[PDB]
């Protein structure tokens, strides 16, 4: 019965885009919860969550920052809440791990390799618009290392896994799939693996169709039937890559964390706006958007009532 | 024109038979109704076969298109694309006669000789076949769709003289290489309307790797001098259409290629499949090409410079 | 057997003609000398055609192999692989007669109907063609190598009854899918000796992406139940052989497939191409398969259980 | 005339393998120079060089460590000398850059992205054989980050480029090709680009034929005709991947830096042994091994007489 069900994840704000880039980027806790609830009611079964300082909008990966967010969304929606362990790519593991460790979510992101994270491409378009000094230092930083060593990843699996949390394994290139294979063969994570292949980041693999098929092909060969595929296309590749995945039996992620645009010369005003576009592609293919309960079964999650919020 | 997707609708064809679906257009008026509805739903190109109204069998004669082409033209400015293949069991200088006489903007052109397999189609439909010609057709394990190098060279010369440009039908890698041979000799000038056909028994399959392989090969052989369209047979129709739309290509739908809408549900109109492809195209943030935009992308002569 | 590479040598074939090279074996004794030298250089399988000694044209009769098979068998324990294709312009129940009568361990089996293009070969050789049949053959733009689904099913049944296993000749993706159809019906049992042929006009090209595409497709359709061999036409012979050897596959060489040794240099013997492939195989740290190791990898009946 | 010429690089010792793994790993300066000269006389046009402490064989990336190596090889051979800027993957950029900066070689390696570097797979086979404590700490370290940020890479290009040195761009995955494309489009390096795609490392892309074709395909699309392709296959993939490259118009790297084995149950005794095997594949294909002078033309190098040793 779960055949032909597509899971839409909506990543509502993230840590990469900054407030000066768009007035529609959710910053406050109430903006983030409204964006999440609106996206779930449009058909997002999973909400991927970051938090921000309400003062200047900078990334906030503290336990307290999620307190006015998680419980509010849960009361209003049964969507699966996916808490970031990535935060801002400049953060340490000790900092990034605390929210998921405390709240024991059904799902948490797990980044699978250390990589350069380049943001200066966003300086070409946005430098003159930046209003906060932290935005200038952040996007100008040519030395960002998004740290996820083999020791880090093993520690996160062990720590968060004890609380029943399952992972969205974020894979930005082929090597991250091989890294995941290493832990999968050691039995440190069990199937079905929720593998998200991320396309178009500076420091990661590109967004060419060859890149998509290569990651899909590699995942197929390394993990067979024991994984569920999701994709993330950055910027204007968002909907193109979501459609490829939906057409190939995979799942999709949209959201203002990854793309600020709704069309040509047009910024996206809400996260739900992007969920509806993906949903239109899903239903045009003759498929159906998965409910949260259907996502929990496809991904083997512990249930929205087994969390600490 | 950068974000415009041409939807071609093939309304009846010659592979499916009337016993397979009551919605398959057969009579001339059913074909014209199907074509006009598909155009109004957003199909810029209509791909056309004719059939004998008696038993529904393929009819590739000149007169068969007479009550079809003019009727559609009067009601729509869609590009009319006349088959030169017909049923895969037919000859050449005769197969090109409809397009030769009517001088359409577009004609299909199959790029290689291949086996055509339909006897698995017999597995499910054998019970409900009404006409004897359907049983012989589908049970035939010796169908050869003939398109020799000499045949293809003849079509390009003969039909090119009428101002007709071609939709190059490519069912496997060899057909792209066959097209590269003629392209290099200058027998066809760009932009090439290359249609890669997936899922037929006797052709390449419909796996996503098959799609990317044909795309990569076309990119390497023809660069920027071609326009890519896809045809996904049967249940692969919309999946492969979505891949193409997402990769900068164009899409073909229609009851010639797929009789099914969902699970155990037959498609009732061609327009219904056009609407689905259109929903995908627009969900992607793209727009469906008008007939006028298709004519520019494909370098066609105009819907008023034909012989009908 | 894990690091053993089967070298097949195709000593003369039916595509090249005698005016193209004085080293192309024609007479029966030239073919047997070529086969024995290739086996002694390390070729475990010898792939065989016969020719008329009068003008060098293909000869696919039963008697044509009589002074060939027994001579080779007496001098070598190589696996003898008899063509069922002959010249691409030939019929079926007759084409299978040599293999039907002699009941070899191996027979070739072409898996699809395709165009065969040789008129570009005419570009360079037209000046030096001695026999009229060479000019008509190479200039023919209408060659159709016929292998319908019904034809192939007939060969599998008829020749399978003699204990003969097949080398499935696959010239494009569709031929692997065609083979998958018969494999699923149980008409051929593994391990399948699948030979992917690259570089022919009418088939897939010889680009590295073409090689990987055929390999990927075969892996997905047949898994571990097949043995992969490659044939790179002309100048691609050793490049594609090296890719296969490096990827766990097997290699085919021979003057049937390539007349050239280097730049403007004709290959003088089949053994010479076998030695080259062997140098590559051993440079990789692998070993060339003996005939006895080939028989185990391919599940053959034995060189003494034949009718010659 | 340079058509059909294959460049063989021989990497004689490296920094990854350790002395306890094989008694044939060159350690002393005289062992390294003998290995280099023997490999060049077998047909290696380029020698890729690391140095080691003669005491315990640990990696030595000091300027002084190359002093008894470079001049000795140059006097005995006209091979192109390729000095590592990678050193041991635990080293900083300030340390790793000094040899190439001082000696101004024709060629230096340039690693194109930050990555995990996993060596514990080598602990499964070798742990009981290790004789030095530094070997145990090194191979057991699950937290190795091979640092090559965008800022680092730009700095190395600028610094070493002023001395006429050209680069072997070491690419361990698709993202490193995209990283190189970024600098190539900014004009910070000029063609022909010597791009080496590295296969089989833990933390990098694997050694499956699909991985090889993917990297080749991506390089083709991003750089067209303006690059020269070399490959490195780790361990027992060394000769397989060298053959694929040679068959596809690329160049090859062998050496005990990457593979300790000559066959089944047989350690390789010399670097030249591996050069001869690759040469046998090259000549079996009907191609020819490039001379040093031919390598200098294919790679646009400044000449062996324009170095500071
Ligand atoms: C650790 C973690 O949490 S990792 C999370 C993963 N997310 C990320 O890292 C962020 C991903 N996204 C990004 O990095 C940024 O959005 C970027 C850098 C890709 C944005 O790049 P930009 O060049 O500014 O934007 P992009 O090219 O994607 O889209 C804007 C352009 O596309 C156009 N566009 C957008 N949608 C459409 C459409 N549907 N049709 C036509 N044009 C469109 C816009 O009009 C604009 O055109 P312009 O360049 O002429 O003005
Ligand atoms: C030279 C020339 O003339 S070329 C013309 C180009 N076109 C052609 O040649 C014809 C192309 N089409 C065909 O050949 C035929 O449609 C075929 C052979 C592909 C049909 O194959 P079949 O096996 O009969 O059907 P197929 O499996 O593709 O689709 C029907 C099945 O899929 C299911 N299905 C199809 N779409 C959906 C959907 N969106 N959701 C759920 N189920 C679906 C149906 O319910 C049915 O289920 P079943 O397999 O359990 O019966
Ligand atoms: C069903 C059946 O019967 S199937 C049997 C399977 N085999 C076949 O069908 C036949 C396969 N072979 C052929 O068709 C022919 O050999 C052909 C058509 C490929 C030959 O093509 P041609 O264009 O004549 O030759 P090709 O370019 O491949 O090789 C000769 C050229 O390459 C050069 N060349 C070949 N190898 C080398 C080398 N190692 N080094 C340098 N140059 C070389 C030659 O010097 C010559 O140079 P040129 O192109 O400037 O003249
Ligand atoms: C920063 C820089 O400088 S980066 C430089 C790049 N270099 C590197 O990073 C190092 C690359 N290499 C390595 O990492 C290591 O050599 C490793 C981890 C790959 C070695 O892995 P291992 O499993 O120990 O060895 P590997 O599997 O490659 O080869 C050994 C096995 O292959 C077998 N083998 C080797 N060659 C052959 C052959 N030709 N035929 C058959 N078997 C063979 C051996 O007999 C052995 O078999 P066994 O496992 O049954 O004992
Ligand atoms: Zn995130
Ligand atoms: Zn048609
Ligand atoms: Zn043959
Ligand atoms: Zn090195």
Numbering used by the authors:
A (entry chain A), D (entry chain A): 2 to 310
B (entry chain B), C (entry chain B): 3 to 310
Sentences copied from the publication:
Next, a β-keto acid cleavage enzyme (BKACE)28,29 converts the non-native substrate MSA with acetyl-CoA into acetoacetate and formyl-CoA. The Claisen-like condensation reaction accepts various β-keto acids that react with acetyl-CoA to form an acyl-CoA ester and acetoacetate. In these assays, BKACE15 from Paracoccus denitrificans performed best. BKACE15 forms a homotetramer where each active site is accommodated in a TIM-barrel fold, and consists of eight β-sheets that are surrounded by eight α-helices.
Each active site also exhibits only one entry channel for both substrates that appears fully occupied upon acetyl-CoA binding. The surface representation of acetyl-CoA highlights the complete occupancy of the entry channel. After the reaction has taken place, formyl-CoA is released before acetoacetate can leave the active site. This hypothesis is further corroborated by the observation that acetoacetate is an inhibitor for the reaction with MSA and acetyl-CoA. However, we also observed that the enzyme was inhibited by its product acetoacetate with a half-maximal inhibitory concentration (IC50) of 1.45 ± 0.16 mM. Substrate labeling is shown in yellow for acetyl-CoA (“ACO”) and acetoacetate (“AAE”) and in dark grey for CoA (“COA”) and malonate (“MLI”). Earlier studies had proposed R254 as a catalytic base involved in the reaction. However, our structures with bound CoA-ester prompted us to revisit the nature of the catalytic base and suggest a different mechanism for the reaction with MSA, in which E171 acts as the catalytic base (discussed in more detail in Supplementary Note 2). Replacing E171 by leucine abolished BKACE activity, while substitution by a chemically similar but shorter aspartate still showed basal activity (5% of the wild type), supporting the role of E171 in catalysis.
